[PDB]
Amino acid sequence: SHMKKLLVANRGEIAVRVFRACNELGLSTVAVYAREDEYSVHRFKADESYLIGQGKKPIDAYLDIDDIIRVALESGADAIHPGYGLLSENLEFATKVRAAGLVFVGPELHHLDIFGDKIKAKAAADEAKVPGIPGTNGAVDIDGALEFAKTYGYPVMIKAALGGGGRGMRVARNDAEMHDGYARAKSEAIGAFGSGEIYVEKYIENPKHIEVQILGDRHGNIIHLHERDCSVQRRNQKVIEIAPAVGLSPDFRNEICEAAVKLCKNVGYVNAGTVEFLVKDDKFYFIEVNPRVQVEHTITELITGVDIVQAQILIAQGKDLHREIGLPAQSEIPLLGSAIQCRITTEDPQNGFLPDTGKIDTYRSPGGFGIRLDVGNAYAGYEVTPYFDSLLVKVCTFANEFSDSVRKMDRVLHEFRIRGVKTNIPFLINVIANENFTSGQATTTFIDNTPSLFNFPRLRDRG
Numbered sequence: 001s002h003m004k005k006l007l008v009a010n011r012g013e014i015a016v017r018v019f020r021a022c023n024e025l026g027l028s029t030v031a032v033y034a035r036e037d038e039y040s041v042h043r044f045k046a047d048e049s050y051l052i053g054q055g056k057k058p059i060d061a062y063l064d065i066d067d068i069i070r071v072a073l074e075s076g077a078d079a080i081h082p083g084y085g086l087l088s089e090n091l092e093f094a095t096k097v098r099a100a101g102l103v104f105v106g107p108e109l110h111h112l113d114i115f116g117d118k119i120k121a122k123a124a125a126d127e128a129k130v131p132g133i134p135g136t137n138g139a140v141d142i143d144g145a146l147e148f149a150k151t152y153g154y155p156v157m158i159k160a161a162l163g164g165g166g167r168g169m170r171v172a173r174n175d176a177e178m179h180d181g182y183a184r185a186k187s188e189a190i191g192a193f194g195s196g197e198i199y200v201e202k203y204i205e206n207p208k209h210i211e212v213q214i215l216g217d218r219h220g221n222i223i224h225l226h227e228r229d230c231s232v233q234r235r236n237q238k239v240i241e242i243a244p245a246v247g248l249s250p251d252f253r254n255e256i257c258e259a260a261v262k263l264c265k266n267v268g269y270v271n272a273g274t275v276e277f278l279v280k281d282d283k284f285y286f287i288e289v290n291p292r293v294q295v296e297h298t299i300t301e302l303i304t305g306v307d308i309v310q311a312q313i314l315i316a317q318g319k320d321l322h323r324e325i326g327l328p329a330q331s332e333i334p335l336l337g338s339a340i341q342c343r344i345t346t347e348d349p350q351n352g353f354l355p356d357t358g359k360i361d362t363y364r365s366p367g368g369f370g371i372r373l374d375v376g377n378a379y380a381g382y383e384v385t386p387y388f389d390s391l392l393v394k395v396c397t398f399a400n401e402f403s404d405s406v407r408k409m410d411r412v413l414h415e416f417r418i419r420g421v422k423t424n425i426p427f428l429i430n431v432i433a434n435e436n437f438t439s440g441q442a443t444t445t446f447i448d449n450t451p452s453l454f455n456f457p458r459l460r461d462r463g
């Protein structure tokens, strides 16, 4: 009946977060790890740990559906939480997990099918009366894209359907440049995902990347947990996420959250999900839905007081969202404060943001009032391999006023000490020192149009 053992098909800090949620819910936990991930923190943070993908690349080891399912069945896990990334959105993974009889902690399979493709997601937003970005219908060839550029005009944004995390995504304003962008996007789409579905759309200039956290229930209860602002981006990759969007007016934020709720209610969404929007001068446009727990769910947890991962596990258990989990009504969902998220990573801001590798000789972590710490593998003596993502530790500061949250993030970033590997901490310090970020009016072009952000000061570093 009720699940007792839970397996996490992920690594790093998200595995530890789900382990903490399962321990708080009284569920015994099971970890999986690759051979090159043998010294990861998440392996020893679980009750049972099993090696997966023996004789494979570590990324493919974590991506192996059959080995994870075999480990979950041999260990006796009744549920599989996929975390974020890797196989979190994989339709085949969730289908095979539900075929094996296990519980997949995530949305229903039709939601994964709809929101895996950007054309299908845009169509679903159209049936939900959520206005998307004006673009071409479906995925077109190069000449159909050129025709769209003819009728609607430059700029035109070229995005592959399966392109995620800025892989196949590239801007264009000239006809030759648009050919170059289509060529590169086709190469990236065939190489990474094997399907070259490219749709082109009008390029909004200076938008705000607003995203809304949604919790869905199997009974039909769907609530939002306010919105985050992920506008601070370097080359369309999120750097700093703030919540709520203090720059935006509260009524506008309510309209955006209500539109996300309307879309999720039309699709009948269940479990946790994030609806992403682009905001430009009182107009918001739907761009995608992330049907999983996101990396920056922590700041939503801080400003709403709602444990997102615990709610995910209880929804996968089938609990009622209000009666059994105990979440209040949507009008009673509180906005407790204003939180900032920064992921301290190994990529070198003085060396083109390439992920550095090495050994962590010393590691110092702040604490105190208003600080939340979510650490991956960043302990002293840990060897940072090039195999995995550069994420060392997510850190969040929360305060009633956004200015005090900025002050505490500055204190934390100056307090933080990782030596032996080179971090983006000077970059984060420079970004949060900026007045555009401090006023909350940062856009997605804020980083790329600010060369003063890259003037990292000399540090004495004696020792």
Ligand SMILES: CC(=O)SCCNC(=O)CCNC(=O)[C@H](O)C(C)(C)COP(=O)(O)OP(=O)(O)OC[C@H]1O[C@@H](n2cnc3c(N)ncnc32)[C@H](O)[C@@H]1OP(=O)(O)O
Binding pocket: 362, 411, 412, 414, 415, 416, 417, 419, 459, 460, 461, 462, 463
């Ligand atoms: C902690 C907070 O409230 S927020 C951030 C402010 N931090 C501090 O004031 C702590 C003292 N200052 C420092 O540690 C550093 O000088 C910082 C934070 C200003 C950054 O300077 P850095 O270039 O990175 O290192 P710095 O050359 O100045 O110091 C060398 C070492 O002497 C240590 N040190 C610094 N001040 C003192 C001190 N008063 N007594 C003993 N050791 C000290 C540092 O911890 C550092 O050791 P580390 O390698 O583990 O980091």
Ligand SMILES: Nc1ncnc2c1ncn2[C@@H]1O[C@H](COP(=O)(O)OP(=O)(O)OP(=O)(O)O)[C@@H](O)[C@H]1O
Binding pocket: 133, 157, 159, 163, 164, 165, 166, 167, 169, 201, 202, 203, 204, 205, 207, 208, 209, 230, 231, 233, 236, 276, 278, 287, 288, 290, 444
């Ligand atoms: N038509 C567009 N005009 C302007 N900017 C766009 C457009 N489409 C996407 N972007 C940019 O893309 C950024 C984030 O990318 P987006 O949300 O479109 O997908 P992604 O990064 O591929 O996916 P994911 O969030 O799943 O990793 C936005 O903050 C915005 O700056």
Ligand SMILES: [Mg+2]
Binding pocket: 165, 276, 288
């Ligand atoms: Mg995106």
